[PDB]
Amino acid sequence: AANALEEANSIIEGKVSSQLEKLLEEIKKDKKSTLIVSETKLANAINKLGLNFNVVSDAVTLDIYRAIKEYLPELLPGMSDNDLSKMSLGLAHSIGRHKLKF
Amino acid sequence: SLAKSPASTIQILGAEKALFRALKTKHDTPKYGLLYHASLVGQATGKNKGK
Amino acid sequence: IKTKKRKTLKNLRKDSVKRGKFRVQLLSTTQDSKTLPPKKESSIIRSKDRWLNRKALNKG
Amino acid sequence: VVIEPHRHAGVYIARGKEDLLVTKNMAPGESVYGEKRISVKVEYRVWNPFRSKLAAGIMGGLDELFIAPGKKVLYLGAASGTSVSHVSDVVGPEGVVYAVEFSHRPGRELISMAKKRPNIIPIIEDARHPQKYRMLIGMVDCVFADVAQPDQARIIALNSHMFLKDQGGVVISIKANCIDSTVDAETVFAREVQKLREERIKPLEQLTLEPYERDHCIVVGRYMR
Amino acid sequence: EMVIEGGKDRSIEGLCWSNVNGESLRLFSIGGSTVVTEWDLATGLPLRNYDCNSGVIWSISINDSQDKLSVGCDNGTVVLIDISGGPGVLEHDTILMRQEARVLTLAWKKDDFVIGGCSDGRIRIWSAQKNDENMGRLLHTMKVDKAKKESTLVWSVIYLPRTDQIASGDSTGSIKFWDFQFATLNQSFKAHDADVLCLTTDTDNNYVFSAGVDRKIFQFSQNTNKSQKNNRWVNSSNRLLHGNDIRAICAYQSKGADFLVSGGVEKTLVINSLTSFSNGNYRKMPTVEPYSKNVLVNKEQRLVVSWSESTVKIWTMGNYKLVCKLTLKDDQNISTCSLSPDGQVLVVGRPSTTKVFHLQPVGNKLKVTKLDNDLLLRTSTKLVKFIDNSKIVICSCEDDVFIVDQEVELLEVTS
Amino acid sequence: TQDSNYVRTLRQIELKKLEKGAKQLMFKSSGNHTIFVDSREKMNEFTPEKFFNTTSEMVNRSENRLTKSIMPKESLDKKKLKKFKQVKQHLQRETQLKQVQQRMDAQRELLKKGSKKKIVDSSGKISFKWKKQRKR
Amino acid sequence: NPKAFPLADAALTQQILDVVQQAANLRQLKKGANEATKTLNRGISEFIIMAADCEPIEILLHLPLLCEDKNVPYVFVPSRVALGRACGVSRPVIAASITTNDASAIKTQIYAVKDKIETLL
Amino acid sequence: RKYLNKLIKRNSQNLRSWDLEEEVRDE
RNA sequence: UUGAGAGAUACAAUUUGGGAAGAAAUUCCCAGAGUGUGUUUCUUUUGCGUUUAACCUGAACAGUCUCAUCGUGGGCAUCUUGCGAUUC
């Protein structure tokens, strides 16, 4: 949700390596037969290959992320375009006032 | 905007009408401005409150 | 035809002509830009070899 | 006193006592930086071709300026609201500008004008790591570059390969001294448009904006794929 | 083994190898331009033209441990290029603290410092040590003894790791050795009569060899135990082996190989021994050893074709008479060529395209006409060798063997 | 020092009038516009109204091309030219005030103290060179 | 101090302080931070020299903020004591502005040093 | 296309003549 | 006479395109490109370019004392008639 603690926590884990508790939740909710994963950033190598997940992020993963980032709001959530921009700017102002002190 | 002003401006900062009339005719400018009501300038007495 | 062959050669080879206030440049080809490194800057190559053939060292 | 429109809606020319360029408002009532405000019932902020850089390209004549009132735009180099205010005015309340900068000394006034306009969302991270704001927004319709760093082509190439949809616009402002001084603007600008069409940016136009800036250019291109 | 040709108005001023242990060899080279060019050794083409983001490159050097690359440019910049991303991918890293004059030569101390000789007669020392407080700023500046009646340029700079010195040759002919810490001269030799273009050292830095436009190779030795405990080079020896200049010198030293290699304006190579320079022997290579030919004849019409850079020429025996030539300037670079038996069609071919020309002897001249084939115009050719009067076999630069005028099955090799 | 203050504030008045007068004008652009095209015929042709769309009115001045009033003959034109002349004479007043304050400041600097000599150039433009001696 | 951007090396700081000494002899510099900011406001400064040696450096790093508005070059030298020696007073000097002139004898030296400054910006 | 091109030319002249100059441009 | 190469700059016709008038012939407005005839700008190019030079600097104004500033008187009106600047 719009909880500032969870938002800024995943924001710090996105601006750093991506081994957050939500990524541990993803490792819980995708453990079927040590499946293949497409990470976004190559610097998240720890949660990319930590435990039973064949990860791949190179030079076409960016193309499929272009596709799924082009059409995040139209089918993935039950949300709308102004709602995605509002939650993005809430997260943005939170992380901005966190890094830039006041 | 107050921080990027020189210390002479911070001296005369309240007394703009006296300052600019005393510059636009060639007279003597004020020396106190808004800073006259500081306690240290209250402790001083004479011409050394200008100082 | 002897006194203008280089003229018609260069005026048919060269690009980026003027159109009033404007200038219509050609973009180059991925063919040449991926088969070869770009040409040397003749200014600096002439500076280096003109230095090594300066008059103060008496070559012969 | 008579406002005529421009080639791009959200950009107008207020003719009359001073035939000068102008944009709309999304800030109701007030200026942001002491730019002049013209009312014609309806409020308007004067753009300056000297105080800002995109206005100089408009005044020099940019036909397919991909900043346009039905889009969303990514601004890599403002540092303060003095240009992205006018970009939020021209893009209107339908879209969104992502003003992304690194030096957090004028990022204070960047966030301060982003408080007033919901059009403007700020990013306070350096534009050579777009992965650090992967999780904020993607798929912009036009990037803008005003970075005065030497790796302009690589920085906006990374930002356009991560966040620019196909066949969109690229507008890059190139300062000649931040790449190579002592050699003229013609060679350094030809070198940079070749460096940018090394990526999937078909160059469309460059112009030199000479009465407003010394040795600058604005290059527009379309992102191929 | 191989030759990688460049075309019209292309030159090459510096080149450096890079071999991280376990990965392929990588070969970068500057020309007279604003880019670095990395070549893949398979095809013989550039696989990367990284435009360095400041000015015209004057020198190139490779880091020790070979993850970074210095390019020293005409506008006084020293630009670091991140190399360790894999073969082919090059990133910009950091422009070091600028200056006025162009930096003409570079060297690294280790991963830490970068030394650069400039065209104002000075030798700067920058720190390329990342995550220090003084990263990128120039720590020291040293000034060599200027010429009286012309400007002085420091042409060659090396670091000597066994001691802690910088050796430097400049355009007065003087060769100076500088203590790195304290950034200051230990001793200067007045060795050559004109500029010292290139100088190098052996493994344990008991010798420093040096050469330039006055065409002698000087050897500075520190092999005595007293020399090593006193840090005192002596001007040991001096040899005259080259004809015009020496523009490049390098040294290799292993268990069964210890030779310094040198070449210059005269086009030949010269091999000398490292630890036995003055005593031992030397070998001046031939100026060309045609492992790739530029001339072939055809017995009919008694004629011979020969191609230099981007032009072919044909003459007949009789005396002899130049019957035709093709200075094709739509071309930029040439490579191998073959004629049909009966002397009908010539085919010229470079690694980017190839082109086939019908020929008709019209008497004391020929008539030459292009015959269009876009498969030939698109293919890369190394070798064309004419099965028949019409059929040729084509070896492509990407290991394809066509038969035109189509595909030979070719098995794979154990890597 | 107080008539130097008078000339300096007059100069600052004209400086601010200059900058916030030139902020509210519009200057005709003069930039080398360049257009990139395909193989050779697009360069050989006229760039056929690719952004002009009239070759009479909306081609050759670029402050606003297009894609399709109180005496507009000479009154607005003379008002425009007169505001440009106002900014130009603000500039002339500001540079004359800068020069006269510079001479006043040189005279004031000259009559303070320290050792100095009258240095004369080729022309007769005199200057005063001060002795290398720091202030006690 | 880390937050004192461009800092000069030894050769550039030696020629900066040489042109400061001859401008002090020609009475062409304003020594002190308030006089430097006054010349910044009035637009009669050629370039600003500051000292990366003051124990609050924030009493300095505000005139960068109006140097980058009037695109006037500015530079840091490591010693306020040495800057005061160069300016030719008996006190340490924190900042110094070399004022503008067009008939100046040392105009070429001022221009050379300010070009060497704006190379490192 | 007469009623479109003629009216477009008339509207373009009636706009562009009211911000332009002939002898004041060099001034 | 830069030996050669490239840019602006006058004259002439020949033209390329967007609009408006006409039956077309063609006209009219506008914006342009190119070739011949003059000036001129930039890069090699040789006798040699000057092979030294320029500038700064050391205790470098001042006994016929030098300089500054405020005044006083006088000359120059057959004109240094004098600028918040030295006219002698």
mmCIF file of C-alpha atoms in Angstrom, chain F:
data_model
loop_
_atom_site.group_PDB
_atom_site.id
_atom_site.type_symbol
_atom_site.label_atom_id
_atom_site.label_comp_id
_atom_site.label_asym_id
_atom_site.label_seq_id
_atom_site.Cartn_x
_atom_site.Cartn_y
_atom_site.Cartn_z
ATOM 1 C CA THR F 1 33.503 58.421 -1.915
ATOM 2 C CA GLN F 2 29.978 59.770 -1.777
ATOM 3 C CA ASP F 3 29.910 60.972 -5.359
ATOM 4 C CA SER F 4 31.326 57.582 -6.322
ATOM 5 C CA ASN F 5 28.354 56.133 -4.427
ATOM 6 C CA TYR F 6 26.040 58.401 -6.425
ATOM 7 C CA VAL F 7 27.442 57.286 -9.784
ATOM 8 C CA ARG F 8 27.450 53.641 -8.666
ATOM 9 C CA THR F 9 23.766 53.614 -7.722
ATOM 10 C CA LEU F 10 22.878 55.374 -10.978
ATOM 11 C CA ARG F 11 24.804 52.643 -12.777
ATOM 12 C CA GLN F 12 22.968 49.952 -10.837
ATOM 13 C CA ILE F 13 19.607 51.529 -11.701
ATOM 14 C CA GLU F 14 20.497 51.386 -15.393
ATOM 15 C CA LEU F 15 21.855 47.850 -14.981
ATOM 16 C CA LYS F 16 18.585 46.569 -13.545
ATOM 17 C CA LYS F 17 16.535 48.501 -16.119
ATOM 18 C CA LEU F 18 18.714 46.936 -18.814
ATOM 19 C CA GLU F 19 18.317 43.361 -17.634
ATOM 20 C CA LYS F 20 14.584 43.504 -16.947
ATOM 21 C CA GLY F 21 13.975 45.400 -20.141
ATOM 22 C CA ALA F 22 15.830 42.889 -22.282
ATOM 23 C CA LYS F 23 13.991 40.111 -20.437
ATOM 24 C CA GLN F 24 10.762 41.417 -22.010
ATOM 25 C CA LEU F 25 11.830 41.705 -25.635
ATOM 26 C CA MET F 26 12.077 39.048 -28.322
ATOM 27 C CA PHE F 27 15.099 38.722 -30.578
ATOM 28 C CA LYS F 28 15.120 37.264 -34.075
ATOM 29 C CA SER F 29 16.949 33.943 -34.082
ATOM 30 C CA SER F 30 19.985 33.407 -36.289
ATOM 31 C CA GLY F 31 20.957 29.749 -36.140
ATOM 32 C CA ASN F 32 22.409 27.400 -38.712
ATOM 33 C CA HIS F 33 19.441 25.089 -39.191
ATOM 34 C CA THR F 34 20.396 21.687 -40.588
ATOM 35 C CA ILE F 35 18.091 18.908 -41.822
ATOM 36 C CA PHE F 36 19.145 15.281 -42.292
ATOM 37 C CA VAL F 37 17.625 13.296 -45.170
ATOM 38 C CA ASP F 38 17.855 10.095 -47.240
ATOM 39 C CA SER F 39 19.974 9.012 -50.119
ATOM 40 C CA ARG F 40 20.463 11.847 -52.614
ATOM 41 C CA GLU F 41 17.194 12.950 -54.227
ATOM 42 C CA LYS F 42 15.767 14.256 -50.932
ATOM 43 C CA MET F 43 18.866 16.448 -50.708
ATOM 44 C CA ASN F 44 18.659 17.403 -54.380
ATOM 45 C CA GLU F 45 15.076 18.612 -54.060
ATOM 46 C CA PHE F 46 13.705 21.747 -52.417
ATOM 47 C CA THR F 47 12.750 20.299 -48.982
ATOM 48 C CA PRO F 48 9.202 20.676 -50.256
ATOM 49 C CA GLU F 49 7.437 22.628 -47.490
ATOM 50 C CA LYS F 50 8.511 20.023 -44.953
ATOM 51 C CA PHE F 51 8.138 22.698 -42.318
ATOM 52 C CA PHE F 52 7.454 25.923 -44.208
ATOM 53 C CA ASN F 53 4.040 25.035 -45.774
ATOM 54 C CA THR F 54 3.914 28.464 -47.436
ATOM 55 C CA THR F 55 6.915 29.686 -49.387
ATOM 56 C CA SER F 56 5.702 33.287 -49.034
ATOM 57 C CA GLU F 57 4.791 34.097 -45.434
ATOM 58 C CA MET F 58 5.815 31.208 -43.176
ATOM 59 C CA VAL F 59 9.158 30.042 -44.539
ATOM 60 C CA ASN F 60 11.928 32.517 -43.899
ATOM 61 C CA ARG F 61 11.235 33.819 -40.425
ATOM 62 C CA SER F 62 11.203 31.048 -37.871
ATOM 63 C CA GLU F 63 9.917 32.660 -34.683
ATOM 64 C CA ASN F 64 6.574 31.027 -35.496
ATOM 65 C CA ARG F 65 5.909 29.128 -38.682
ATOM 66 C CA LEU F 66 2.506 27.524 -39.029
ATOM 67 C CA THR F 67 0.489 24.562 -40.259
ATOM 68 C CA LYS F 68 -2.870 25.602 -41.654
ATOM 69 C CA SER F 69 -4.945 45.444 -34.379
ATOM 70 C CA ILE F 70 -4.430 49.155 -33.735
ATOM 71 C CA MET F 71 -3.021 50.404 -37.065
ATOM 72 C CA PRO F 72 -0.891 47.292 -37.785
ATOM 73 C CA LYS F 73 0.785 49.130 -40.690
ATOM 74 C CA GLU F 74 3.451 51.240 -38.985
ATOM 75 C CA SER F 75 2.276 52.098 -35.449
ATOM 76 C CA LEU F 76 3.131 48.750 -33.854
ATOM 77 C CA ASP F 77 6.369 48.630 -35.858
ATOM 78 C CA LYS F 78 7.514 52.031 -34.621
ATOM 79 C CA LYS F 79 6.557 51.088 -31.052
ATOM 80 C CA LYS F 80 8.640 47.892 -31.346
ATOM 81 C CA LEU F 81 11.646 49.718 -32.787
ATOM 82 C CA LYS F 82 11.375 52.435 -30.144
ATOM 83 C CA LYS F 83 11.419 49.921 -27.291
ATOM 84 C CA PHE F 84 14.526 48.375 -28.864
ATOM 85 C CA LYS F 85 16.076 51.852 -29.001
ATOM 86 C CA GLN F 86 15.171 52.345 -25.334
ATOM 87 C CA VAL F 87 17.126 49.222 -24.397
ATOM 88 C CA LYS F 88 20.045 50.374 -26.569
ATOM 89 C CA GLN F 89 20.192 53.774 -24.885
ATOM 90 C CA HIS F 90 19.963 52.093 -21.471
ATOM 91 C CA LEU F 91 23.073 50.226 -22.585
ATOM 92 C CA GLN F 92 24.842 53.435 -23.633
ATOM 93 C CA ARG F 93 23.972 55.120 -20.320
ATOM 94 C CA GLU F 94 25.184 52.086 -18.367
ATOM 95 C CA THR F 95 28.531 51.871 -20.135
ATOM 96 C CA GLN F 96 29.172 55.609 -19.753
ATOM 97 C CA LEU F 97 28.348 55.383 -16.055
ATOM 98 C CA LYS F 98 30.674 52.387 -15.712
ATOM 99 C CA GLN F 99 33.538 54.324 -17.279
ATOM 100 C CA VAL F 100 33.044 57.443 -15.168
ATOM 101 C CA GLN F 101 32.788 55.400 -11.959
ATOM 102 C CA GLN F 102 35.934 53.551 -13.006
ATOM 103 C CA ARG F 103 37.862 56.819 -13.356
ATOM 104 C CA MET F 104 36.425 58.077 -10.060
ATOM 105 C CA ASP F 105 37.470 54.854 -8.352
ATOM 106 C CA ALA F 106 40.983 55.077 -9.790
ATOM 107 C CA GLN F 107 41.336 58.619 -8.428
ATOM 108 C CA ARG F 108 40.031 57.573 -5.009
ATOM 109 C CA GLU F 109 42.346 54.546 -4.980
ATOM 110 C CA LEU F 110 45.190 56.851 -5.916
ATOM 111 C CA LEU F 111 44.753 59.280 -3.046
ATOM 112 C CA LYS F 112 44.778 56.730 -0.224
ATOM 113 C CA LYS F 113 48.443 56.071 0.761
ATOM 114 C CA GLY F 114 51.467 54.012 -0.173
ATOM 115 C CA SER F 115 54.296 54.670 -2.570
ATOM 116 C CA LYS F 116 53.463 54.964 -6.257
ATOM 117 C CA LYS F 117 54.824 56.292 -9.530
ATOM 118 C CA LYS F 118 53.182 57.791 -12.593
ATOM 119 C CA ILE F 119 53.537 55.258 -15.419
ATOM 120 C CA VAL F 120 53.090 56.714 -18.910
ATOM 121 C CA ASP F 121 52.369 54.478 -21.907
ATOM 122 C CA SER F 122 52.940 55.011 -25.637
ATOM 123 C CA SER F 123 49.833 57.172 -26.048
ATOM 124 C CA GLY F 124 49.565 59.254 -22.903
ATOM 125 C CA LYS F 125 47.107 57.128 -20.988
ATOM 126 C CA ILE F 126 48.731 57.435 -17.586
ATOM 127 C CA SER F 127 48.538 54.796 -14.888
ATOM 128 C CA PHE F 128 49.905 54.604 -11.376
ATOM 129 C CA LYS F 129 52.035 51.627 -10.405
ATOM 130 C CA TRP F 130 52.262 50.964 -6.696
ATOM 131 C CA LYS F 131 55.359 49.818 -4.852
ATOM 132 C CA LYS F 132 55.566 46.160 -3.897
ATOM 133 C CA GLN F 133 55.012 46.653 -0.175
ATOM 134 C CA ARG F 134 52.333 45.038 1.905
ATOM 135 C CA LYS F 135 50.105 46.954 4.269
ATOM 136 C CA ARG F 136 51.376 47.209 7.848
#
